[model samples]
Target: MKKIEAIIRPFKLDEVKIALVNAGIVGMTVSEVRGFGRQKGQTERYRGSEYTVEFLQKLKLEIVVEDAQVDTVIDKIVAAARTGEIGDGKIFVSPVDQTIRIRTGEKN
Candidate 1:
């Protein structure tokens, strides 16, 4: 078992999601997240002065799958979210020792 945690641009969610669905991923969780990164950011102006140090707004995806599916899922995420830019995103994978589904009381 394995877990994939991906932080990607908010705008890229739809594409990544579609890719995942197309790849046979039955479920995933998404959340809005904030972080600091190297990407260019928004600026604000007042009285001819400017201010800014932007924190990137991103979407974090949490998905768990069989070990064999990890690489395929990561590939889908990257292929959908990549822009060849500095702050495109980050993906982390962790080993999962157990899993359970609440509503149906399922365990694996």
Candidate 2:
């Protein structure tokens, strides 16, 4: 099994989700997050003053899938999320030893 984590622009969430579904992914976890990367936030003006926004908002999407589907899922996310711009976010894949469905006591 593998765990795929993707941090993407908030606006791209729906596109990513659709792509995943079309790729046969059944489930995933999504969350709102904030952090800074090479883009390192940006400056914004309010009235007559400028302020530095140190952290940018991002969406975190996580999915655990069978090993065979790992690359397919990752590619689906990347294709849907890429904007050809900085702060488009990143994707990380890691090994998952096992998974259990607590309610049904099923393990995989």
Candidate 3:
């Protein structure tokens, strides 16, 4: 099994989901998360003063698939999230030792 995690622009979530669905992927978990990278934070003006703001908004999408599906999943994710600009996001794949659906007693 493989676990794929993609950190993507918040607004891109809808597009990513649609892309995955069109590619025959039916399951994934989407979460709203915060992080920083080349974005290096930003300055916010509040009360007539500027303050450094870090941890920009990002969406964490986690998908678990059969080993053979990794390549296709990665391609779909990258194509959907890429913007050719800083802060576009990142994708990570790792081994999923095991997975079991607690209620249904299904294993993968």
Candidate 4:
């Protein structure tokens, strides 16, 4: 098994979800998060003053899938989330030693 975690722009949630479903992914977890990477944050103006926004809002999508589906799933998310711009987001894949379905008490 493998765990995939993608941090993407908030507005791209629906697109990513649809793409995952179309790719035969049955389940995923979504989270609202804030962080900064190479682009850092940005400056904004209000009342004639400028302020540095240190943290940018992003959406975290996490899914655990069989090893065979890892690459395809990552590609699906990349295609759906890429915007050809900085801060478009990033994806991380890691080895998952085990997974359990709470309701069914099934382990994989």
Candidate 5:
């Protein structure tokens, strides 16, 4: 199995979800997270004052899938999440040793 985590622009969440579903993927966890990348935080204007925000808001979407589905899932995510601009976020994939359904005691 594989665990894929995609940190995406908040506004793109819906599109990403739709794309993933079209690719036959479901069951994902969404989290509201904040972090800074190489671009750091972009400047913002609040009450007519401009300042650099230290942390930008991002959505962390985590999904677990069979190894064979990893590539398709990733492609769908990138295609839907990309904006061709900075702060579009990133994707990370890792090995998942096990997955168990607590209610049915099913393991995969």
Candidate 6:
């Protein structure tokens, strides 16, 4: 098994999600996250003052699947998320030693 984690632009969530569904991925986890990287941060004007927002909002997606499905999943994510610009986000893949069904205590 493999665990795939992708940090993506918040707005890209829908497209990426649909892409994954179309690819036959049944389950995934999505969370709101904030961080900064090469884009640094941005300043916004509020009332009479300007302040820097050091962290940008992003969506983190996680899914666990069989090793053979890794390539297909990653491909769909990249195709759906790319914007031809920076801050497009990143994907990380790692090995999963085992997966167990909580209620049944079945290992896969």
Q: What is the TM-score of each predicted model, taking all chains together?
A: 0.87, 0.90, 0.88, 0.90, 0.90, 0.90
Q: How accurate is candidate 4 locally (lDDT)?
A: 0.88
- Stretches of model 1 off by over 4 angstroms after superposition: 38-43, 46-49
Candidate 2 Cα errors over 4 Å, as ranges: 38-41
lDDT of 2 by residue, 33-94 (tens): 99685465477789788777767899999999998888788887989999996888899899
lDDT of 6 by residue, 12-108 (tens): 9999989999998978999999868546546678887877776789999999999999999999999999999788899999999998888899998
Report the Cα lDDT for candidate 3: 0.87
lDDT of 1 by residue, 6-91 (tens): 99989998899899999999779999998784446567777677767568678999999999888889988899999986788899
Off by over 4 Å in 5: 38-41
User: Measured by TM-score, how close is model 6 to the native structure?
Assistant: 0.90
Inter-residue clash pairs, candidate 5: none
True lDDT of residue 15, candidate 6? 97
lDDT, candidate 3, at 108: 75
Give the count of colliding residue pairs in each prediction: 0, 0, 0, 0, 0, 0
lDDT of 5 by residue, 1-108 (tens): 999999999999999999988987888999999968557546778887777776788999999999889988998899999999788888999998989898999988
| Model 4 alpha-carbon miss at residue 106, Å | 0.9
Question: lDDT tens string, model 3, 12-69?
Answer: 9889999999978888998899987446546678887777766888999998988998
Report the Cα RMSD per candidate: 2.0, 1.7, 1.7, 1.7, 1.7, 1.6
Rank list by lDDT: 6, 5, 4, 2, 1, 3
**lDDT per residue (tens digit) for residues 1-108 in model 4:** 889999999999999999999988878999999967446547678877777776789999999998888888988899999999688888999898998889999988
Candidate 4 regions off by >4 Å?
A: 37-41
